Amino acid sequence: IPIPRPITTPHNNFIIFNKVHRFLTYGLANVV
Amino acid sequence: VVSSIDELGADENLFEDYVKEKSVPNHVPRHQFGIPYPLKNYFALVL
């Protein structure tokens, strides 16, 4: 009277990346 | 100061250039764009 058969569908996952840049703007003329 | 013009008896034109904060887009709307500004009217005493 026991049950036997086991199986399954998916397999998900995660991951990340780290970065550090140095940028610069400049007091651009507030013009037309 | 070496010439002072009589900013007086001038009364909707006096403080009328200031009004630009129009047609000429080449006066970046003073406000809105948050731009600095100089004042053009200074006080003084006379005799």
Side-chain angles (χ1 to χ4, degrees), chain A, chain B residues 1-15 17-21 23-47:
Chain A
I1 40 287
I3 308 318
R5 180 256 68 180
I7 314 83
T8 205
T9 49
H11 298 90
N12 215 183
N13 228 172
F14 274 41
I15 173 58
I16 72 310
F17 301 115
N18 44 327
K19 306 294 169 294
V20 306
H21 329 302
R22 304 169 187 49
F23 304 134
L24 36 173
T25 72
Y26 301 90
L28 177 63
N30 181 1
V31 69
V32 212
Chain B
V1 49
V2 302
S3 339
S4 70
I5 301 179
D6 267 320
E7 305 193 272
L8 50 86
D11 289 345
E12 290 177 350
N13 286 337
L14 177 63
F15 294 97
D17 286 345
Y18 274 139
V19 191
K20 229 19 272 177
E21 322 175 16
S23 67
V24 206
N26 315 289
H27 184 86
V28 189
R30 244 46 194 181
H31 194 44
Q32 294 247 298
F33 270 105
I35 209 65
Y37 197 62
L39 303 198
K40 342 295 194 64
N41 336 300
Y42 285 52
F43 187 65
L45 279 170
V46 72
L47 150 57

Coordinates of all heavy atoms in Angstrom, one line a residue, unseen atoms left out:
Chain A
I1 N 0.8 -1.3 0.0 CA 0.0 0.0 0.0 C 0.8 1.3 0.0 O 0.2 2.4 0.1 CB -1.0 0.0 1.2 CG1 -0.4 -0.5 2.5 CG2 -2.3 -0.7 0.9 CD1 -0.2 -2.1 2.5
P2 N 2.2 1.3 -0.2 CA 2.9 2.5 -0.2 C 3.0 3.2 -1.5 O 2.7 2.6 -2.6 CB 4.3 2.1 0.3 CG 4.5 0.8 -0.4 CD 3.1 0.1 -0.2
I3 N 3.5 4.4 -1.5 CA 3.7 5.2 -2.7 C 5.1 5.2 -3.0 O 5.9 5.2 -2.1 CB 3.2 6.6 -2.6 CG1 1.7 6.6 -2.0 CG2 3.3 7.3 -4.0 CD1 0.9 5.5 -2.7
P4 N 5.5 5.3 -4.2 CA 6.9 5.2 -4.6 C 7.6 6.3 -5.3 O 8.7 6.8 -5.0 CB 7.0 3.9 -5.5 CG 5.6 3.8 -6.1 CD 4.7 4.3 -5.0
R5 N 6.9 6.8 -6.4 CA 7.6 7.6 -7.5 C 7.7 9.1 -7.3 O 6.6 9.8 -7.3 CB 7.0 7.3 -8.8 CG 7.6 8.0 -10.0 CD 6.7 9.2 -10.5 NE 6.6 10.2 -9.5 CZ 5.9 11.3 -9.7 NH1 5.2 11.5 -10.8 NH2 5.8 12.3 -8.7
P6 N 8.9 9.6 -7.2 CA 9.1 11.1 -7.0 C 9.9 11.8 -8.1 O 10.9 11.2 -8.5 CB 9.7 11.2 -5.7 CG 10.5 9.9 -5.5 CD 9.6 8.9 -6.1
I7 N 9.5 13.0 -8.6 CA 10.2 13.7 -9.6 C 9.8 15.2 -9.5 O 9.0 15.6 -8.7 CB 10.0 13.2 -11.0 CG1 10.1 11.7 -11.0 CG2 11.0 13.8 -12.0 CD1 8.8 11.0 -10.6
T8 N 10.4 16.0 -10.4 CA 10.0 17.5 -10.5 C 10.4 18.4 -11.7 O 11.2 18.0 -12.5 CB 10.4 18.2 -9.2 OG1 9.6 19.4 -9.0 CG2 11.9 18.7 -9.3
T9 N 9.9 19.6 -11.8 CA 10.1 20.5 -12.9 C 11.3 21.4 -12.9 O 12.2 21.3 -13.7 CB 8.8 21.3 -13.2 OG1 8.3 21.9 -12.0 CG2 7.7 20.4 -13.8
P10 N 11.2 22.5 -12.0 CA 12.2 23.5 -12.2 C 13.5 23.6 -11.3 O 13.7 22.8 -10.4 CB 11.4 24.8 -12.1 CG 10.5 24.5 -10.9 CD 10.4 23.0 -10.8
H11 N 14.3 24.6 -11.6 CA 15.5 24.9 -10.8 C 16.0 26.4 -11.1 O 16.7 26.6 -12.0 CB 16.6 24.0 -11.2 CG 16.3 22.5 -10.8 ND1 15.7 21.7 -11.7 CD2 16.5 21.8 -9.7 CE1 15.5 20.5 -11.1 NE2 16.1 20.6 -9.9
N12 N 15.5 27.3 -10.2 CA 15.9 28.7 -10.3 C 17.2 29.1 -9.5 O 17.8 28.3 -8.8 CB 14.7 29.5 -9.7 CG 14.5 30.8 -10.4 OD1 13.6 31.6 -10.1 ND2 15.4 31.1 -11.4
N13 N 17.6 30.4 -9.7 CA 18.8 30.9 -9.0 C 19.1 32.4 -9.1 O 18.5 33.2 -9.8 CB 20.0 30.2 -9.5 CG 20.9 29.7 -8.4 OD1 21.9 29.0 -8.6 ND2 20.6 30.1 -7.2
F14 N 20.0 32.9 -8.2 CA 20.4 34.3 -8.1 C 21.8 34.5 -8.2 O 22.6 33.6 -8.3 CB 19.9 34.9 -6.8 CG 18.5 35.3 -6.7 CD1 17.5 34.6 -7.4 CD2 18.1 36.5 -6.0 CE1 16.1 35.0 -7.3 CE2 16.8 36.9 -5.9 CZ 15.8 36.2 -6.6
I15 N 22.2 35.8 -8.3 CA 23.6 36.3 -8.4 C 23.6 37.8 -8.6 O 22.6 38.4 -9.0 CB 24.3 35.6 -9.5 CG1 25.7 36.3 -9.7 CG2 23.5 35.7 -10.8 CD1 26.6 36.2 -8.5
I16 N 24.7 38.5 -8.3 CA 24.9 39.9 -8.4 C 26.2 40.4 -8.8 O 27.2 39.7 -8.8 CB 24.6 40.7 -7.1 CG1 25.7 40.4 -6.1 CG2 23.2 40.3 -6.6 CD1 26.1 39.0 -5.9
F17 N 26.3 41.7 -9.1 CA 27.6 42.3 -9.5 C 27.8 43.6 -8.8 O 26.8 44.3 -8.5 CB 27.7 42.5 -11.0 CG 27.5 41.2 -11.8 CD1 26.3 41.1 -12.6 CD2 28.4 40.2 -11.7 CE1 26.1 39.9 -13.3 CE2 28.2 39.0 -12.5 CZ 27.1 38.9 -13.3
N18 N 29.1 43.9 -8.4 CA 29.4 45.1 -7.7 C 30.4 45.9 -8.6 O 31.4 45.4 -9.1 CB 30.0 44.8 -6.4 CG 31.0 43.6 -6.4 OD1 30.9 42.7 -7.2 ND2 32.0 43.6 -5.5
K19 N 30.2 47.2 -8.7 CA 31.1 48.1 -9.5 C 31.1 49.5 -8.9 O 30.2 50.0 -8.3 CB 30.6 48.2 -10.9 CG 30.4 46.9 -11.6 CD 31.7 46.1 -11.8 CE 31.5 44.7 -12.2 NZ 30.8 43.8 -11.2
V20 N 32.3 50.2 -9.0 CA 32.5 51.5 -8.4 C 33.2 52.5 -9.3 O 34.4 52.5 -9.4 CB 33.2 51.4 -7.1 CG1 32.6 50.4 -6.2 CG2 34.7 50.9 -7.4
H21 N 32.4 53.3 -10.0 CA 33.1 54.2 -10.9 C 33.2 55.6 -10.3 O 32.6 55.9 -9.3 CB 32.3 54.3 -12.2 CG 31.6 53.1 -12.6 ND1 32.2 51.9 -12.8 CD2 30.2 52.9 -12.8 CE1 31.3 51.0 -13.1 NE2 30.1 51.6 -13.1
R22 N 34.1 56.4 -11.0 CA 34.3 57.7 -10.6 C 34.0 58.6 -11.8 O 34.5 58.4 -12.8 CB 35.8 57.9 -10.3 CG 36.2 56.9 -9.2 CD 37.7 56.8 -9.0 NE 38.1 55.7 -8.2 CZ 37.6 54.5 -8.3 NH1 36.8 54.2 -9.3 NH2 37.9 53.5 -7.4
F23 N 33.0 59.5 -11.6 CA 32.6 60.3 -12.7 C 32.7 61.8 -12.3 O 32.9 62.1 -11.2 CB 31.2 60.0 -13.1 CG 31.0 58.6 -13.5 CD1 29.9 58.0 -13.1 CD2 31.9 58.0 -14.4 CE1 29.6 56.6 -13.4 CE2 31.6 56.7 -14.8 CZ 30.5 56.0 -14.3
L24 N 32.5 62.7 -13.3 CA 32.5 64.1 -13.1 C 31.8 64.9 -14.1 O 31.8 64.7 -15.3 CB 33.9 64.7 -12.9 CG 35.2 64.2 -13.5 CD1 36.3 65.2 -13.1 CD2 35.6 62.8 -13.1
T25 N 31.0 65.8 -13.6 CA 30.2 66.8 -14.3 C 31.0 68.1 -14.2 O 32.1 68.1 -13.7 CB 28.9 67.0 -13.7 OG1 29.1 67.8 -12.5 CG2 28.3 65.6 -13.3
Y26 N 30.5 69.2 -14.8 CA 31.1 70.4 -14.7 C 30.1 71.6 -14.9 O 29.1 71.5 -15.6 CB 32.2 70.5 -15.8 CG 33.3 69.5 -15.7 CD1 33.1 68.3 -16.4 CD2 34.4 69.7 -15.0 CE1 34.1 67.3 -16.3 CE2 35.4 68.8 -14.9 CZ 35.2 67.6 -15.5 OH 36.2 66.6 -15.5
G27 N 30.4 72.7 -14.3 CA 29.4 73.7 -14.0 C 29.1 74.3 -15.3 O 29.4 75.4 -15.7
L28 N 28.3 73.4 -16.1 CA 28.0 73.7 -17.5 C 27.1 75.0 -17.5 O 26.3 75.2 -16.7 CB 27.3 72.6 -18.1 CG 26.8 72.8 -19.5 CD1 28.0 73.0 -20.5 CD2 25.9 71.6 -20.0
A29 N 27.4 75.8 -18.5 CA 26.8 77.1 -18.6 C 25.3 76.9 -18.7 O 24.8 76.2 -19.6 CB 27.3 77.9 -19.8
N30 N 24.5 77.6 -17.9 CA 23.1 77.4 -17.8 C 22.4 78.2 -19.0 O 21.6 79.1 -18.7 CB 22.5 77.9 -16.5 CG 21.0 77.7 -16.4 OD1 20.4 77.2 -17.3 ND2 20.4 78.0 -15.2
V31 N 22.8 77.9 -20.2 CA 22.4 78.7 -21.3 C 21.5 78.0 -22.4 O 21.2 76.8 -22.4 CB 23.6 79.2 -22.1 CG1 24.4 78.1 -22.7 CG2 23.2 80.3 -23.1
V32 N 21.1 78.9 -23.3 CA 20.2 78.6 -24.5 C 20.9 78.2 -25.7 O 21.6 79.0 -26.3 CB 19.3 79.8 -24.8 CG1 18.0 79.3 -25.4 CG2 19.1 80.7 -23.6
Chain B
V1 N 30.0 103.3 -7.7 CA 28.9 104.1 -8.2 C 29.6 105.4 -8.6 O 30.4 106.0 -7.9 CB 27.9 104.4 -7.1 CG1 28.6 105.0 -5.8 CG2 26.8 105.4 -7.6
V2 N 29.2 105.8 -9.8 CA 29.9 107.0 -10.4 C 28.9 107.8 -11.2 O 29.3 108.7 -11.9 CB 31.1 106.7 -11.3 CG1 32.1 105.9 -10.5 CG2 30.6 105.9 -12.5
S3 N 27.7 107.2 -11.4 CA 26.6 107.8 -12.1 C 25.6 107.0 -11.4 O 25.8 105.9 -10.9 CB 26.7 107.4 -13.6 OG 28.0 107.1 -14.0
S4 N 24.4 107.7 -11.2 CA 23.3 107.0 -10.6 C 22.2 107.6 -11.4 O 22.1 108.8 -11.6 CB 23.1 107.5 -9.1 OG 22.8 108.8 -9.0
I5 N 21.3 106.8 -11.8 CA 20.2 107.3 -12.7 C 19.0 107.4 -11.8 O 18.9 106.6 -10.8 CB 19.9 106.3 -13.9 CG1 21.2 106.1 -14.7 CG2 18.8 106.9 -14.7 CD1 21.0 105.2 -15.9
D6 N 18.1 108.3 -12.0 CA 17.0 108.4 -11.1 C 15.9 107.4 -11.4 O 14.9 107.6 -12.1 CB 16.3 109.8 -11.3 CG 16.9 110.8 -10.2 OD1 17.1 110.5 -9.1 OD2 17.1 112.0 -10.6
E7 N 16.1 106.2 -10.7 CA 15.1 105.1 -10.8 C 14.0 105.7 -10.0 O 13.9 105.4 -8.8 CB 15.7 103.8 -10.2 CG 17.0 103.3 -10.7 CD 17.4 101.9 -10.3 OE1 18.0 101.7 -9.2 OE2 17.0 100.9 -11.0
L8 N 13.1 106.4 -10.7 CA 12.0 107.0 -10.0 C 11.2 107.8 -11.0 O 11.7 108.2 -12.0 CB 12.5 108.0 -8.9 CG 13.5 109.0 -9.5 CD1 12.8 110.2 -10.1 CD2 14.5 109.5 -8.4
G9 N 9.9 107.9 -10.7 CA 9.0 108.5 -11.7 C 9.4 107.9 -13.1 O 9.8 108.7 -14.0
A10 N 9.4 106.6 -13.2 CA 9.7 105.9 -14.4 C 8.5 105.2 -15.0 O 8.0 104.2 -14.5 CB 10.8 104.9 -14.1
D11 N 6.0 103.6 -13.8 CA 5.7 103.0 -12.5 C 5.3 101.5 -12.7 O 4.9 100.9 -11.7 CB 4.6 103.7 -11.7 CG 5.1 105.1 -11.2 OD1 6.3 105.3 -11.2 OD2 4.3 106.0 -10.8
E12 N 5.4 101.0 -13.9 CA 5.1 99.7 -14.2 C 6.2 99.2 -15.2 O 6.1 98.1 -15.8 CB 3.7 99.5 -14.8 CG 2.6 99.8 -13.8 CD 1.2 99.7 -14.5 OE1 1.1 99.7 -15.7 OE2 0.2 99.7 -13.8
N13 N 7.1 100.1 -15.4 CA 8.3 99.8 -16.3 C 9.5 99.7 -15.4 O 10.4 99.0 -15.7 CB 8.4 100.9 -17.4 CG 7.3 100.7 -18.5 OD1 6.7 99.7 -18.7 ND2 7.1 101.8 -19.2
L14 N 9.5 100.5 -14.3 CA 10.6 100.5 -13.4 C 11.0 99.1 -13.0 O 12.1 98.6 -13.4 CB 10.2 101.3 -12.1 CG 11.3 101.4 -11.0 CD1 12.5 102.1 -11.5 CD2 10.7 102.0 -9.8
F15 N 10.2 98.4 -12.2 CA 10.5 97.1 -11.8 C 9.9 96.2 -12.9 O 9.2 95.2 -12.6 CB 9.8 96.7 -10.5 CG 10.4 97.5 -9.3 CD1 9.8 98.6 -8.8 CD2 11.6 97.1 -8.7 CE1 10.3 99.3 -7.8 CE2 12.1 97.8 -7.6 CZ 11.5 98.9 -7.2
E16 N 10.2 96.5 -14.2 CA 9.7 95.8 -15.4 C 10.6 94.9 -16.2 O 10.2 94.1 -17.0 CB 9.0 96.7 -16.4
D17 N 11.9 95.1 -15.9 CA 12.9 94.2 -16.6 C 12.9 93.0 -15.8 O 13.0 91.8 -16.3 CB 14.3 94.9 -16.7 CG 14.3 96.0 -17.8 OD1 13.4 96.1 -18.6 OD2 15.2 96.8 -17.9
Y18 N 12.9 93.2 -14.5 CA 12.9 92.1 -13.5 C 11.9 91.1 -13.9 O 12.1 89.9 -13.7 CB 12.5 92.7 -12.1 CG 13.6 93.3 -11.2 CD1 13.4 94.5 -10.5 CD2 14.8 92.6 -11.1 CE1 14.4 94.9 -9.7 CE2 15.8 93.1 -10.2 CZ 15.6 94.3 -9.5 OH 16.6 94.7 -8.6
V19 N 10.8 91.6 -14.4 CA 9.7 90.8 -14.9 C 10.2 89.5 -15.6 O 9.4 88.6 -15.8 CB 8.7 91.5 -15.8 CG1 7.5 90.7 -16.0 CG2 8.4 92.8 -15.1
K20 N 11.4 89.5 -16.0 CA 11.9 88.4 -16.7 C 12.5 87.3 -15.8 O 13.7 87.2 -15.7 CB 12.8 88.8 -17.8 CG 12.5 88.2 -19.1 CD 11.0 87.6 -19.1 CE 10.9 86.2 -18.6 NZ 9.5 85.7 -18.6
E21 N 11.6 86.5 -15.2 CA 11.9 85.4 -14.3 C 10.8 84.4 -14.3 O 9.6 84.8 -14.3 CB 12.1 86.0 -12.8 CG 12.8 87.3 -12.7 CD 12.8 87.9 -11.3 OE1 12.6 87.1 -10.3 OE2 13.1 89.1 -11.1
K22 N 10.1 85.9 -21.5 CA 8.9 86.4 -22.2 C 8.9 86.0 -23.7 O 8.7 84.9 -24.1 CB 8.8 87.9 -22.1
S23 N 9.3 87.0 -24.6 CA 9.4 86.8 -26.0 C 10.8 86.3 -26.3 O 11.0 85.3 -27.1 CB 9.1 88.1 -26.8 OG 10.2 89.0 -26.5
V24 N 11.7 87.0 -25.7 CA 13.2 86.7 -25.9 C 13.5 85.5 -24.9 O 13.7 85.7 -23.7 CB 14.0 87.9 -25.5 CG1 15.4 87.9 -26.2 CG2 13.3 89.2 -25.8
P25 N 13.7 84.3 -25.5 CA 14.1 83.1 -24.8 C 15.5 83.2 -24.3 O 16.0 82.4 -23.4 CB 13.9 82.0 -25.8 CG 14.4 82.7 -27.1 CD 13.7 84.0 -27.0
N26 N 16.2 84.2 -24.8 CA 17.6 84.5 -24.4 C 17.7 85.4 -23.2 O 18.3 86.5 -23.3 CB 18.2 85.0 -25.7 CG 17.8 84.2 -26.9 OD1 18.3 83.1 -27.1 ND2 17.0 84.8 -27.8
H27 N 17.1 84.9 -22.1 CA 17.1 85.5 -20.8 C 16.5 84.1 -20.3 O 15.3 83.9 -20.3 CB 16.1 86.7 -20.7 CG 16.2 87.3 -19.3 ND1 17.1 88.3 -18.9 CD2 15.4 87.2 -18.2 CE1 16.9 88.7 -17.7 NE2 15.8 88.0 -17.2
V28 N 17.4 83.2 -19.9 CA 17.0 81.9 -19.4 C 16.0 82.3 -18.3 O 16.5 82.9 -17.3 CB 18.2 81.2 -18.9 CG1 17.9 79.8 -18.6 CG2 19.3 81.3 -20.0
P29 N 14.7 82.0 -18.4 CA 13.8 82.3 -17.3 C 14.6 82.2 -16.0 O 15.1 81.2 -15.6 CB 12.7 81.3 -17.4 CG 13.4 80.2 -18.1 CD 14.2 80.8 -19.1
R30 N 14.8 83.4 -15.3 CA 15.5 83.4 -14.1 C 15.2 82.3 -13.1 O 16.0 81.5 -12.7 CB 15.3 84.8 -13.5 CG 16.6 85.6 -13.4 CD 17.4 85.5 -14.7 NE 18.8 85.9 -14.6 CZ 19.6 86.0 -15.5 NH1 19.3 85.6 -16.8 NH2 20.9 86.4 -15.3
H31 N 13.9 82.3 -12.7 CA 13.4 81.3 -11.8 C 13.2 80.1 -12.6 O 13.8 80.0 -13.7 CB 12.1 81.8 -11.2 CG 11.6 81.0 -10.0 ND1 12.5 80.7 -8.9 CD2 10.4 80.6 -9.6 CE1 11.8 80.1 -8.0 NE2 10.5 80.0 -8.4
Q32 N 12.5 79.1 -12.1 CA 12.3 77.9 -13.0 C 13.6 77.1 -13.1 O 13.6 76.0 -12.7 CB 11.8 78.3 -14.3 CG 10.5 79.0 -14.3 CD 9.5 78.1 -15.0 OE1 9.6 77.8 -16.2 NE2 8.5 77.6 -14.3
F33 N 14.6 77.8 -13.6 CA 15.9 77.2 -13.8 C 16.8 77.5 -12.6 O 17.9 77.0 -12.5 CB 16.5 77.8 -15.0 CG 16.2 77.0 -16.2 CD1 15.3 77.5 -17.2 CD2 16.8 75.8 -16.4 CE1 15.0 76.7 -18.3 CE2 16.5 75.0 -17.6 CZ 15.6 75.5 -18.5
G34 N 16.2 78.2 -11.6 CA 17.0 78.5 -10.4 C 18.3 79.1 -10.7 O 19.4 78.6 -10.4
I35 N 18.2 80.3 -11.2 CA 19.4 81.0 -11.6 C 19.7 82.3 -10.7 O 18.8 83.0 -10.3 CB 19.3 81.5 -13.1 CG1 20.7 81.5 -13.7 CG2 18.6 82.8 -13.2 CD1 21.4 80.2 -13.8
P36 N 21.0 82.5 -10.4 CA 21.4 83.7 -9.5 C 20.9 85.0 -10.2 O 20.4 85.0 -11.3 CB 22.9 83.5 -9.5 CG 23.2 82.8 -10.7 CD 22.2 81.7 -10.8
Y37 N 21.2 86.1 -9.5 CA 20.8 87.4 -10.1 C 21.4 88.5 -9.3 O 21.7 88.4 -8.2 CB 19.3 87.4 -10.3 CG 18.9 88.5 -11.2 CD1 19.2 88.4 -12.5 CD2 17.9 89.4 -10.7 CE1 18.7 89.3 -13.4 CE2 17.4 90.3 -11.6 CZ 17.8 90.3 -13.0 OH 17.2 91.1 -13.9
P38 N 21.5 89.7 -9.9 CA 22.1 90.9 -9.2 C 20.9 91.8 -9.1 O 19.9 91.6 -9.9 CB 23.1 91.5 -10.1 CG 22.5 91.2 -11.5 CD 22.0 89.8 -11.4
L39 N 20.9 92.7 -8.2 CA 19.7 93.6 -8.0 C 20.2 94.8 -8.7 O 21.5 95.0 -8.8 CB 19.4 93.9 -6.6 CG 19.1 92.6 -5.8 CD1 18.4 93.0 -4.5 CD2 18.3 91.7 -6.6
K40 N 19.3 95.6 -9.3 CA 19.8 96.8 -10.0 C 19.4 98.1 -9.3 O 19.6 99.2 -9.9 CB 19.1 96.8 -11.4 CG 18.6 95.5 -11.9 CD 19.7 94.5 -12.1 CE 19.3 93.2 -12.9 NZ 18.8 93.6 -14.3
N41 N 18.8 98.1 -8.1 CA 18.4 99.2 -7.4 C 19.1 99.3 -6.1 O 18.9 98.5 -5.2 CB 16.9 99.2 -7.2 CG 16.2 98.4 -8.2 OD1 16.2 98.6 -9.4 ND2 15.4 97.3 -7.8
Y42 N 19.9 100.3 -5.9 CA 20.6 100.4 -4.6 C 20.1 101.6 -3.9 O 19.7 102.6 -4.5 CB 22.1 100.4 -4.7 CG 22.6 99.0 -5.0 CD1 22.1 98.3 -6.1 CD2 23.7 98.5 -4.3 CE1 22.6 97.0 -6.4 CE2 24.2 97.2 -4.5 CZ 23.6 96.5 -5.6 OH 24.1 95.2 -5.9
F43 N 20.1 101.6 -2.5 CA 19.6 102.7 -1.7 C 20.7 103.7 -1.5 O 21.9 103.5 -1.8 CB 19.1 102.2 -0.4 CG 18.4 103.3 0.5 CD1 17.3 103.9 0.1 CD2 19.0 103.7 1.7 CE1 16.6 104.9 0.8 CE2 18.4 104.7 2.5 CZ 17.2 105.3 2.0
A44 N 20.3 104.9 -1.0 CA 21.3 105.9 -0.8 C 20.5 107.0 0.0 O 19.3 106.9 0.1 CB 22.0 106.2 -2.0
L45 N 21.2 108.0 0.5 CA 20.6 109.1 1.2 C 21.1 110.2 0.3 O 22.0 110.1 -0.5 CB 21.1 109.3 2.6 CG 20.4 108.4 3.7 CD1 21.2 108.5 5.0 CD2 19.0 108.7 3.8
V46 N 20.4 111.4 0.5 CA 20.7 112.5 -0.3 C 20.5 113.8 0.5 O 19.8 113.8 1.5 CB 19.9 112.6 -1.6 CG1 18.5 112.9 -1.3 CG2 20.5 113.6 -2.5
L47 N 21.1 114.9 0.0 CA 21.0 116.2 0.6 C 21.1 117.3 -0.4 O 22.0 117.2 -1.3 CB 22.0 116.4 1.7 CG 22.5 117.8 2.0 CD1 21.4 118.7 2.3 CD2 23.6 117.8 3.1

